[PDB]
Amino acid sequence: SMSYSWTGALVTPCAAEEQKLPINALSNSLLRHHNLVYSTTSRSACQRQKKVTFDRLQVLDSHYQDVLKEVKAAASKVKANLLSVEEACSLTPPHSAKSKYGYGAKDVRSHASRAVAHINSVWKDLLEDSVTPIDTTIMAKNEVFCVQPEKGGRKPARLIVFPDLGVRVCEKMALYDVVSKLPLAVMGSSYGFQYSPGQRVEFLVQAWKSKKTPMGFSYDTRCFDSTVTESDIRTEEAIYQCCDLDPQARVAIKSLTERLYVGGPLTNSRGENCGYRRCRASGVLTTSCGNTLTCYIKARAACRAAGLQDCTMLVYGDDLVVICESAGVQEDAASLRAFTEAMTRYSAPPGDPPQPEYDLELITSCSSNVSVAHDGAGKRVYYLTRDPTTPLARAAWETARHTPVNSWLGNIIMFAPTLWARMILMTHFFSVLIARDQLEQALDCEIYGACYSIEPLDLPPIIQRLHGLSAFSLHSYSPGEINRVAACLRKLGVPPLRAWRHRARSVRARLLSRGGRAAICGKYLFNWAVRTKLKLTPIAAAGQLALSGWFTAGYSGGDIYH
Numbered sequence: 001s002m003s004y005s006w007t008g009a010l011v012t013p014c015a016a017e018e019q020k021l022p023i024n025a026l027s028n029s030l031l032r033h034h035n036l037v038y039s040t041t042s043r044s045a046c047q048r049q050k051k052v053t054f055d056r057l058q059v060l061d062s063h064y065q066d067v068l069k070e071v072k073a074a075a076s077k078v079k080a081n082l083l084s085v086e087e088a089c090s091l092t093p094p095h096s097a098k099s100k101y102g103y104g105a106k107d108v109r110s111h112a113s114r115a116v117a118h119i120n121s122v123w124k125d126l127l128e129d130s131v132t133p134i135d136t137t138i139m140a141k142n143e144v145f146c147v148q149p150e151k152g153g154r155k156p157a158r159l160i161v162f163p164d165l166g167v168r169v170c171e172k173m174a175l176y177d178v179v180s181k182l183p184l185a186v187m188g189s190s191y192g193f194q195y196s197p198g199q200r201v202e203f204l205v206q207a208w209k210s211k212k213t214p215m216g217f218s219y220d221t222r223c224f225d226s227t228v229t230e231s232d233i234r235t236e237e238a239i240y241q242c243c244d245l246d247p248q249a250r251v252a253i254k255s256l257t258e259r260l261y262v263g264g265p266l267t268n269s270r271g272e273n274c275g276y277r278r279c280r281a282s283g284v285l286t287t288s289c290g291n292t293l294t295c296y297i298k299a300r301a302a303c304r305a306a307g308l309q310d311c312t313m314l315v316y317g318d319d320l321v322v323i324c325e326s327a328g329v330q331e332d333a334a335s336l337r338a339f340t341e342a343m344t345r346y347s348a349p350p351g352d353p354p355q356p357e358y359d360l361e362l363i364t365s366c367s368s369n370v371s372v373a374h375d376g377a378g379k380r381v382y383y384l385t386r387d388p389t390t391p392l393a394r395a396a397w398e399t400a401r402h403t404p405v406n407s408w409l410g411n412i413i414m415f416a417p418t419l420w421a422r423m424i425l426m427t428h429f430f431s432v433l434i435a436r437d438q439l440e441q442a443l444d445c446e447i448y449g450a451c452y453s454i455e456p457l458d459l460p461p462i463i464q465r466l467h468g469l470s471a472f473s474l475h476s477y478s479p480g481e482i483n484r485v486a487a488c489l490r491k492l493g494v495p496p497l498r499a500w501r502h503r504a505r506s507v508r509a510r511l512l513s514r515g516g517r518a519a520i521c522g523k524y525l526f527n528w529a530v531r532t533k534l535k536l537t538p539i540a541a542a543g544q545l546a547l548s549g550w551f552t553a554g555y556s557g558g559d560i561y562h
C-alpha cells in the first residue's frame with residue numbers, strides 16, 4: 001500500500017516561521033555568514049510529502065521469520081507494568097503540544113482536573129473501542145541547517161505526526177515500561193541507546209579489534225518511517241504482547257496499535273483533512289523502540305541472507321552499522337550488494353548504496369565518526385566527533401532566539417571531548433550565560449530525543465561521567481579533524497581557534513572568581529586555554545550524580561521528560 005494518501009490540503013504553520021538567521025550581536029560573535037543559515041518551514045512541506053510517498057512492496061523470507069522467532073523468545077523474558085495516570089503525567093515535558101480539548105502540558109504536569117478527566121476518558125475509550133482510527137496532527141518541523149549549494153541547496157522540512165496530548169499520556173501508561181525494558185532485552189549489546197558516548201566508543205573499538213580483518217559499513221534506509229509497513233507495526237504489537245503484561249495493558253496496546261500506530265487520518269493546524277497515513281508516525285511513544293526493533297530484525301535477517309561472517313551490529317532507530325569479518329575485497333562488495341537486496345525485499349532500500357570500509361574512522365553513522373586524540377600522558381584516546389557545521393548553525397540560532405528546549409547544551413555534553421565543542425561552543429555559551437546573567441538557571445535540553453532539565457554549572461561532573469577525566473586534557477587531534485573544523489570556520493565566518501582561546505582565558509577568569517561550581521567549570525572546562533595548567537583530579541560531585549536513566553532507552557519523538 002501507499003505510505004500516505006493526500007487530499008491536496010497544505011501542511012500549515014501554527015505560528016510565525018522565521019526562514020533566516022536573525023541578526024543578533026551575541027549570535028554574530030559566533031557566526032557571521034548568517035545568510036547561509038536557514039530554518040526549515042511549512043513552505044517546503046510539499047517537497048517532503050512527495051519524497052515520503054510511495055508504494056511498499058514487502059516480501060518476507062525464512063531468515064526474517066527465524067530472527068523474529070528469536071526476538072519473540074527474548075521478549076518473553078520481560079515483565080512490564082502499567083503506569084498510573086499520575087506517573088505518566090509527570091513524564092510529560094512542560095512544552096509538550098497542548099490538547100485540543102481545553103488544556104496543556106502545564107495542566108497535565110499539575111494533575112489538573114480537566115486534563116486528568118480527558119485522559120481518563122481517552123483511556124476508557126481505548127479499552128472499549130479497538131477499531132476507530134485516532135486523529136493525528138501533521139506539522140512541519142522547524143530545524144536549522146547551513147546551506148550546501150553544491151548538494152542541492154536547502155533541505156525540505158521533516159514531517160511530524162502526533163496524536164492529542166490526552167492520547168500521548170495514555171500511550172505512556174500502556175507502553176512506557178515496555179519501551180524502557182524490551183529493546184535491551186531483545187537486542188542486548190546491539191541496542192544503541194544503552195551507551196554513553198564513552199561506552200559507545202569502547203564498544204566500537206573492541207568490536208573492530210575483535211575481527212582478524214575487520215570490515216564495516218553503515219546502512220542508510222531511504223525514508224525509514226515510510227518503509228515501515230502495516231504488517232511491520234502489527235508485528236511490533238505481537239512482540240510487545242510476548243511480555244508479561246497487565247490485562248488492561250494488553251487491551252490498550254492492541255487498541256493503540258490498530259487505531260493509531262498502524263495508521264490514521266492526518267489533520268493540519270487549521271483542522272483540515274490532509275490525508276491518510278499507512279506507515280510509521282514520527283511523533284508517537286513507540287517510534288524509537290519500534291524503529292530500532294524493526295531495523296534490527298530486518299538487518300539481522302539481511303546479514304544472514306548476505307552471508308556476512310561474525311557480525312557485530314549497532315542499531316539506533318533507523319541508523320545501522322555492521323562490523324564483520326572480511327571475506328576479501330570483491331567478496332565483501334558482493335555480500336554488501338546481497339545485504340542491500342535483502343533489506344530492499346524487506347521494504348527498506350537504501351538512500352545511497354552502502355560501501356565497505358576497512359578503516360574504523362571512515363565509517364559515518366548518526367552523522368558521527370570515531371577519531372583519535374591524546375591524553376596528558378600521551379596515550380591514544382578514541383572519541384566520537386562530527387562535522388560541526390550544523391551544531392554551530394543551531395548554536396547561533398539558539399543564541400539569537402530563546403528556544404524553550406535547546407539543542408546546544410546536549411550537543412556540548414555529548415561532543416565534549418571534541419576540539420570544536422571545547423574551544424568554540426563551551427567558550428561561546430559560557431560567555432553568553434555570563435553576559436545575560438543566566439549562569440545559575442536550569443535549562444530544558446534535548447538528549448537522545450528526551451527532554452532533560454540541566455544546570456550548565458553541572459557540566460564538568462556530567463562530562464566526567466560520560467567521557468572520563470581525559471575529556472578535559474585531550475590534545476594532538478588528528479590532521480583530518482583539525483582540517484574539517486578549519487573548513488567549517490571559513491565557511492560559516494566563525495572566528496579562528498586562537499581567537500576563541502583568548503576569549504576562553506577571559507571566561508575562565510570570570511568563572512574562577514565566582515567560586516564554587518562556577519570555579520570548577522573554569523578550572524576543568526578551560527584548562528586547555530592556559531599554559532600554566534591546573535591539576536585535574538576526579539570531581540567529587542560526579543560520583544554523586546544520578547545519571548542511570550540517561551542511557552536506559554531511546555525516546556525520540558516520544559514526548560518524554562526526565
Ligand SMILES: CNC(=O)c1c(-c2ccc(F)cc2)oc2cc(N(c3cc(Cl)c4c(c3)COB4O)S(C)(=O)=O)c(C3CC3)cc12
Binds near residue numbers: 319368369370410448
Ligand atoms: C548506530 N550508530 C551509532 O550508534 C552511533 C555512532 C557510530 C557507530 C559506528 C561507527 F562506525 C560510527 C559512528 O556514533 C554515534 C554518535 C552518537 N552521538 C551523537 C550525539 C548527538 Cl547530541 C548528536 C549526534 C551524535 C549527531 O547529531 B547530534 O544531534 S554521541 C556523541 O555518542 O552521543 C550517537 C547518539 C545516540 C545518538 C549514536 C552514535
